[PDB]
Design a protein around this ligand. Structure first.
Ligand SMILES: *[C@@H]1O[C@H](CO)[C@@H](O[C@@H]2O[C@H](CO)[C@@H](O[C@@H]3O[C@H](CO[C@H]4O[C@H](CO)[C@@H](O)[C@H](O)[C@@H]4O)[C@@H](O)[C@H](O[C@H]4O[C@H](CO)[C@@H](O)[C@H](O)[C@@H]4O)[C@@H]3O)[C@H](O)[C@H]2NC(C)=O)[C@H](O)[C@H]1NC(C)=O
Ligand SMILES: *[C@@H]1O[C@H](CO)[C@@H](O[C@@H]2O[C@H](CO)[C@@H](O[C@@H]3O[C@H](CO[C@H]4O[C@H](CO)[C@@H](O)[C@H](O)[C@@H]4O)[C@@H](O)[C@H](O[C@H]4O[C@H](CO)[C@@H](O)[C@H](O)[C@@H]4O)[C@@H]3O)[C@H](O)[C@H]2NC(C)=O)[C@H](O)[C@H]1NC(C)=O
Ligand SMILES: *[C@@H]1O[C@H](CO)[C@@H](O[C@@H]2O[C@H](CO)[C@@H](O[C@@H]3O[C@H](CO)[C@@H](O)[C@H](O)[C@@H]3O)[C@H](O)[C@H]2NC(C)=O)[C@H](O)[C@H]1NC(C)=O
Ligand SMILES: *[C@@H]1O[C@H](CO)[C@@H](O[C@@H]2O[C@H](CO)[C@@H](O[C@@H]3O[C@H](CO)[C@@H](O)[C@H](O)[C@@H]3O)[C@H](O)[C@H]2NC(C)=O)[C@H](O)[C@H]1NC(C)=O
Ligand SMILES: *[C@@H]1O[C@H](CO)[C@@H](O[C@@H]2O[C@H](CO)[C@@H](O[C@@H]3O[C@H](CO)[C@@H](O)[C@H](O)[C@@H]3O)[C@H](O)[C@H]2NC(C)=O)[C@H](O)[C@H]1NC(C)=O
Ligand SMILES: *[C@@H]1O[C@H](CO)[C@@H](O[C@@H]2O[C@H](CO)[C@@H](O[C@@H]3O[C@H](CO)[C@@H](O)[C@H](O)[C@@H]3O)[C@H](O)[C@H]2NC(C)=O)[C@H](O)[C@H]1NC(C)=O
Ligand SMILES: *[C@@H]1O[C@H](CO)[C@@H](O[C@@H]2O[C@H](CO)[C@@H](O[C@@H]3O[C@H](CO)[C@@H](O)[C@H](O)[C@@H]3O)[C@H](O)[C@H]2NC(C)=O)[C@H](O)[C@H]1NC(C)=O
Ligand SMILES: *[C@@H]1O[C@H](CO)[C@@H](O[C@@H]2O[C@H](CO)[C@@H](O[C@@H]3O[C@H](CO)[C@@H](O)[C@H](O)[C@@H]3O)[C@H](O)[C@H]2NC(C)=O)[C@H](O)[C@H]1NC(C)=O
Ligand SMILES: *[C@@H]1O[C@H](CO)[C@@H](O[C@@H]2O[C@H](CO)[C@@H](O[C@@H]3O[C@H](CO)[C@@H](O)[C@H](O)[C@@H]3O)[C@H](O)[C@H]2NC(C)=O)[C@H](O)[C@H]1NC(C)=O
Ligand SMILES: *[C@@H]1O[C@H](CO)[C@@H](O[C@@H]2O[C@H](CO)[C@@H](O[C@@H]3O[C@H](CO)[C@@H](O)[C@H](O)[C@@H]3O)[C@H](O)[C@H]2NC(C)=O)[C@H](O)[C@H]1NC(C)=O
Ligand SMILES: *[C@@H]1O[C@H](CO)[C@@H](O[C@@H]2O[C@H](CO)[C@@H](O[C@@H]3O[C@H](CO)[C@@H](O)[C@H](O)[C@@H]3O)[C@H](O)[C@H]2NC(C)=O)[C@H](O)[C@H]1NC(C)=O
Ligand SMILES: *[C@@H]1O[C@H](CO)[C@@H](O[C@@H]2O[C@H](CO)[C@@H](O)[C@H](O)[C@H]2NC(C)=O)[C@H](O)[C@H]1NC(C)=O
Ligand SMILES: *[C@@H]1O[C@H](CO)[C@@H](O)[C@H](O)[C@H]1NC(C)=O
Ligand SMILES: *[C@@H]1O[C@H](CO)[C@@H](O)[C@H](O)[C@H]1NC(C)=O
Ligand SMILES: *[C@@H]1O[C@H](CO)[C@@H](O)[C@H](O)[C@H]1NC(C)=O
Ligand SMILES: *[C@@H]1O[C@H](CO)[C@@H](O)[C@H](O)[C@H]1NC(C)=O
Ligand SMILES: *[C@@H]1O[C@H](CO)[C@@H](O)[C@H](O)[C@H]1NC(C)=O
Lengths: 136, 447, 136, 136, 53
């Protein structure tokens, strides 16, 4: 398989290839870093603005994934419950049938709620872990 | 035992004072107006719809307006943005030529307008035309005996004509801080510009600040909360101006008032100069009005405050500006696209124990920011113009007599350009977050 | 509460908000990335220099926190002892009473020492862990 | 010892100083961030292009180290075997005698193979760890 | 090495345009002698001895 090749796969079988999207998400800067000494400086500026935008996108995703308990992991389990309000579909059908493109729109509305649950659950969990290491 | 171990915290609420590059934001409605038209309408990012301020409880912070680096960024931005607006406009060099002149024709109150005739290129390089324009006496000088004259700038630089679609009008500019920095507002109504503010709020952008320019009186700026406030860097030093901020406005009206005709001369292929063609009515002097009772009352408030700093029995009096160049001795401001210098000697001569009319003069050739080279010719504007404004406050200088100590004389100070917006940036401080911190507690890492 | 809102709190109750400061410390680039098609490119340069400075500040803090044993954690316990020379204040008074603004200046002198202790303790600790995984 | 001071050391004793290269790898931007206000903008462009290139190099190394299991660690044991085709030298001679410069050339060819093995071993491992937490 | 003009030479300004001036070479105050440089002979003769070596 190649980049995005699983996009029309079912979500289940798409899970075993997440690294393929992940590497390309930044290292595609290889095209722009490949190259006049100053003249036509605007073409430099068009590349340069695109480069800082590319690192900011990556860095925001890593930051967000790191205020949750997940930094440096491609899969992560958590400790906040899935209210059926977020989706009334059963577990089997979403992992069996849907593509990731389909699933994303079908939960799009609730997303900004769910990140708040994760964030607050994590910070109080780190304090509970310090409250233990104070005597462990 | 309570053995103590260092523990790290990240995202700690703590900060330090810093120099950092703020960035503008501009009104998202005005942003829809045509490119370069005033002050980066198109290029300055459109506004965040709210100042998202948070009152910081219990904190006390050392504000200082006189040292505030935020003013230098505004001054430097304004200069840079001003020059960037003029770069595309015509350099007026071919107009630097010998002028014959005569005094103006129809009725006058005094020969301030010269009617002048000269030879000017057509677009066709080999063809040139005799032509005439009016000019004000301040725009020209006599090279002589014989009535031979030149423009005032011809022996020092060639001015750009200002592009006539561009307006100088000061739209509100917000200043905003980049990520990892924050603005603090001092909220205390009694803050005098230097010391511990006891009520602070963070915000991501300032309120709108308008880039007005004037000397002796501050115009259209923000009014003080409860009373006239007077601020100084170090008040026993005569070299430092007192800034006075009013509680009410005082309304000022000002008018050209003559009916003036634009005319175009096509100097070159795709280049044209706006001559001052003719005056349609009979001629009357440019002037401003202020309502006398409101002024007489307002200086009563200003004295009531100065008395606190200098002592109750001081015989405080005002006087006009001493002497020197027109640009430093007078009100020096723009109305509607035209540049007014007005004789404030009518206001400043009270002593302490209906409308005033201020006469004015006008220049077309100008040098704001006072560079040696750079110069503007501001083209004439059609018809009649007048505008209304609020005097917000004023700049005073206290004269250093080795005299009897019972009295102080204050004069309208002229002042540096910065004070036109240091009168807003007194409330704002900028800080750098220091989000990483360490502290002891009794825990251990597992091993 | 909102951004910086705990700054006049005692350190104890301030310890729960840290995610708020942490998110705003980079994501505030949302203002600058919101926007002339090239003309007045200098205002682009004023934004662009601020953007690279914003990521460098964040990235240095993450690097430093990552050569200590703390990457991706907002609270972290350690294993180097607190020399009372750094502060003779008892544990209770500092967590009970002081604000973070107050505490920072009161240990500002020693801070550059403490980072060196943490660094060296961590690297020898990782090598001791390899000396164990060599047979575990 | 200072920056790179162990480069002619045996690999063994060089292992205890990795932090000295690591901190200098990014924080050296202190030289470039230390400064004219717009004019000669080209020198600003030289600094600015160098700064984005420096953070991109650092992010790429951290990303690569984080699609493997290793993010936030200077040493890491793993779970893929060392085929002697990569080097027929015994374990003792390389840790005793060679310098890191000498080692790098002597394995240079195989490197792009080895990174692929590491990546794949990790992603299937994270899914195996979820297959456990699904019932624990 | 020492080197010298050595003539006593006069700057003059011609104002070619509005805010533009050209620096003419106005006059020579002394009588005229050629620009030249000196080097100490023994040090040069010795130095080429080293270069040949
Ligand atoms: C702050 O406030 C003070 C007080 O009002 C102002 O002082 C006045 O300033 C004006 C302008 O300089 C003075 O008017 C001028 O006076 C000159 C001196 O007059 C004497 O000498 C001449 C020549 O020897 C005699 O003819 C004359 O009789 C006096 O003996 C005159 O030379 C000036 O002449 C010009 O104006 C007249 C106007 O009619 C023309 O006819 C002339 O051709 C010529 O253009 C002029 O008259 C005035 O005298 C000052 N008043 C006092 C009481 O001193 C300050 O100016 C003010 N500051 C600012 C910045 O506004
Ligand atoms: C202190 O603050 C006050 C209030 O903001 C300022 O006063 C205003 O100043 C602006 C200019 O800066 C004035 O605007 C001008 O109005 C002219 C007339 O049009 C207006 O009024 C008529 C009815 O009288 C309406 O029909 C019309 O819709 C407008 O509302 C315009 O001609 C001016 O220029 C425009 O037209 C020309 C010719 O086509 C174009 O070249 C221009 O680009 C532009 O499009 C301009 O719009 C405004 O009228 C003033 N208001 C008052 C109450 O006085 C002060 O200027 C300010 N002081 C300082 C020192 O900053
Ligand atoms: C594009 O969609 C198709 C349809 O899902 C994917 O192909 C394979 O389709 C079959 C059904 O036609 C899926 O079911 C399984 O088929 C095998 C025989 O191939 C059978 O032994 C099993 O009992 C079961 O019925 C199969 O899961 C599916 N393949 C995958 C990888 O899921 C096709 O792969 C999709 N394209 C891409 C690139 O994702
Ligand atoms: C503007 O344009 C006109 C036409 O190009 C210039 O006309 C000048 O006209 C006079 C004739 O009146 C020419 O001759 C001189 O006249 C005076 C008396 O006026 C006389 O004393 C002299 O002996 C001589 O005959 C004059 O040469 C001519 N000028 C040129 C440059 O051709 C006029 O000078 C221009 N004015 C300006 C201020 O540019
Ligand atoms: C460029 O042209 C101007 C005008 O000839 C030269 O400057 C000076 O301009 C003033 C005002 O027209 C002349 O009057 C004197 O002004 C002073 C101002 O402080 C005032 O104190 C005196 O009472 C008097 O009114 C002045 O004579 C004139 N010339 C000089 C030498 O100052 C300017 O110098 C010229 N610059 C160049 C580079 O050619
Ligand atoms: C604006 O308000 C602040 C207070 O909110 C005023 O602060 C003044 O700070 C000076 C610092 O020098 C104090 O003056 C003297 O300080 C020396 C020590 O440096 C001390 O030995 C003297 O006894 C004296 O205290 C001053 O007391 C303090 N307060 C006052 C009423 O001035 C600041 O001066 C105010 N400025 C204006 C223009 O209103
Ligand atoms: C400033 O000086 C000019 C001189 O050019 C005045 O404008 C008018 O200039 C024309 C020639 O360009 C003059 O000549 C002719 O006058 C007769 C009068 O019957 C008229 O029928 C022709 O169409 C032509 O205009 C004209 O006399 C002159 N006008 C006046 C009133 O002097 C200009 O008016 C002077 N003053 C001002 C305020 O600009
Ligand atoms: C700014 O305005 C003042 C107004 O005070 C101008 O100064 C002079 O003011 C006096 C009154 O203080 C005027 O007095 C009159 O002078 C004539 C002189 O012949 C006399 O006949 C009258 O009996 C009366 O005394 C004076 O006209 C006025 N001077 C002028 C030239 O207007 C001051 O000049 C103005 N500022 C500037 C820079 O011009
Ligand atoms: C402040 O400025 C005003 C206006 O420039 C000065 O007011 C004028 O003061 C004089 C002397 O007190 C008044 O008295 C006399 O009036 C007659 C008739 O006009 C005149 O012939 C005398 O020569 C003398 O001026 C004068 O009426 C008055 N002018 C006005 C328009 O009210 C005032 O003196 C200045 N100083 C102070 C301390 O207010
Ligand atoms: C600004 O400072 C005040 C004062 O510390 C903070 O408010 C709260 O103050 C009370 C004391 O009045 C602290 O103690 C608690 O008081 C209640 C009764 O009022 C009592 O039931 C509790 O057992 C306890 O003694 C309280 O801890 C303190 N709040 C916090 C969050 O510590 C105020 O919070 C400060 N501002 C900010 C933004 O934190
Ligand atoms: C540059 O290379 C030399 C040679 O490896 C490094 O110095 C030290 O050399 C000795 C052998 O001459 C190494 O072996 C050990 O020597 C001690 C006695 O000094 C002995 O007690 C031990 O049993 C063992 O034989 C020693 O390991 C080596 N030092 C290091 C740090 O490996 C020299 O340090 C190298 N320079 C740098 C900065 O790496
Ligand atoms: C404008 O009018 C004034 C006053 O009539 C003129 O000034 C006088 O001109 C004559 C002749 O050149 C001189 O002898 C006088 O000395 C001048 N008086 C003063 C006070 O300077 C002036 O020449 C006219 N200017 C123009 C351009 O027409
Ligand atoms: C300014 O002009 C308006 C309209 O004529 C008028 O209502 C106002 O009272 C004037 N104010 C002054 C100070 O003249
Ligand atoms: C000056 O007047 C004020 C207001 O009445 C008063 O508070 C102050 O004590 C007075 N001081 C003197 C020395 O008269
Ligand atoms: C100026 O004069 C012309 C001709 O009389 C007229 O069309 C115009 O309306 C006048 N403007 C004013 C403000 O009176
Ligand atoms: C002048 O002051 C009044 C005070 O109510 C304010 O409403 C107005 O916006 C101010 N500005 C102008 C130009 O009138
Ligand atoms: C150069 O000039 C200085 C000062 O006259 C003198 O001391 C030196 O010896 C000269 N050297 C030569 C090579 O002439």
């Amino acid at each position: 398989l190649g980049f995005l090749g699983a996009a029309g796969s079912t979500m289940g079988a798409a899970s075993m290839t997440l690294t393929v999207q992940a590497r390309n998400l930044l290292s595609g800067i290889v095209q722009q870093q490949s190259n006049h000494l100053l003249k036509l400086t605007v073409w430099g500026i068009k590349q340069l603005q695109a480069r800082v935008l590319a690192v900011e996108r990556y860095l925001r995703d890593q930051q967000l994934l790191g205020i949750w308990g997940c930094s440096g992991k491609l899969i992560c389990c958590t400790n906040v419950p899935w209210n059926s309000s977020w989706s009334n579909r059963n577990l089997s059908e979403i992992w069996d049938n849907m593509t990731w493109l389909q699933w994303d729109k079908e939960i799009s509305n609730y997303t900004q709620i769910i990140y708040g649950l994760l964030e607050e659950s994590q910070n109080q969990q780190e304090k509970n872990e310090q409250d233990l290491l104070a005597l462990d | 035992a309570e053995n103590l171990w260092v523990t790290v915290y990240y995202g700690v609420p703590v900060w330090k004072d810093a120099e950092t590059t703020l960035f503008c934001a501009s009104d998202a409605k005005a942003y829809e107006t045509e490119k370069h038209n005033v002050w980066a309408t198109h290029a300055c990012v459109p506004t965040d719809p709210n100042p998202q301020e948070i009152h910081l409880e219990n904190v006390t912070e050392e504000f200082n307006m006189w040292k505030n680096n935020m003013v230098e960024q505004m001054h430097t931005d304004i200069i840079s943005l001003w020059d960037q607006s003029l770069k595309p406009c015509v350099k007026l060099t071919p107009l630097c030529v010998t002028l014959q002149c005569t005094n103006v024709t129809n009725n006058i109150t005094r020969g301030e307008l010269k009617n002048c005739s000269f030879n000017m290129t057509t677009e066709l390089r080999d063809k040139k035309q005799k032509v005439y324009s009016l000019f004000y006496r301040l725009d020209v000088v006599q090279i002589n005996s014989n009535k031979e004259y030149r423009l005032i700038n011809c022996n020092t630089s060639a001015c750009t004509q200002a592009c006539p679609k561009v307006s100088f009008e000061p739209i509100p500019i917000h200043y905003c801080a980049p990520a990892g920095f924050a603005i603090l507002k001092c909220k205390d109504k009694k803050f005098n510009g230097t010391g511990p503010c006891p009520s602070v709020s963070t915000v991501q952008c300032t309120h709108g600040i308008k880039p007005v320019v004037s000397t002796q009186l501050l115009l259209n700026g923000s009014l003080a909360e409860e009373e006239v406030m007077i601020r100084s860097e170090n008040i026993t030093n005569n070299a430092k101006n007192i800034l006075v901020q009013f509680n009410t406005p005082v309304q000022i009206n000002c008018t050209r008032p003559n009916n003036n005709t634009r005319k175009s001369i096509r100097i070159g292929p795709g280049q044209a100069f706006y001559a001052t063609g003719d005056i349609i009515g009979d001629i009357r002097q440019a002037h401003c009005n202020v309502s006398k009772a409101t002024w007489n009352e307002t200086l009563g408030k200003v004295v009531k405050q100065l008395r606190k700093h200098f002592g109750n029995n001081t015989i405080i009096r005002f006087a006009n500006s001493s002497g020197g160049d027109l640009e430093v001795t007078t009100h020096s401001f723009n109305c509607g696209g035209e540049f007014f210098y007005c004789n404030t000697s009518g206001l400043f001569n009270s002593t302490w124990i209906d409308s005033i009319t201020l006469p004015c003069r006008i220049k077309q050739i100008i040098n704001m920011w006072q560079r040696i080279g750079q110069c503007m010719y501001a083209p004439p504007i059609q018809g009649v113009i007048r505008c209304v404004s609020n005097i917000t406050g004023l700049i005073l200088t206290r004269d250093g007599g080795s005299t009897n100590s019972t009295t102080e004389t204050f004069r309208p100070g002229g002042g540096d350009m910065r004070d036109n917006w240091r009168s807003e940036l007194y409330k704002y401080k900028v800080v750098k977050i220091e989000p990483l911190g360490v502290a002891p507690t009794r825990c251990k890492r597992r091993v």
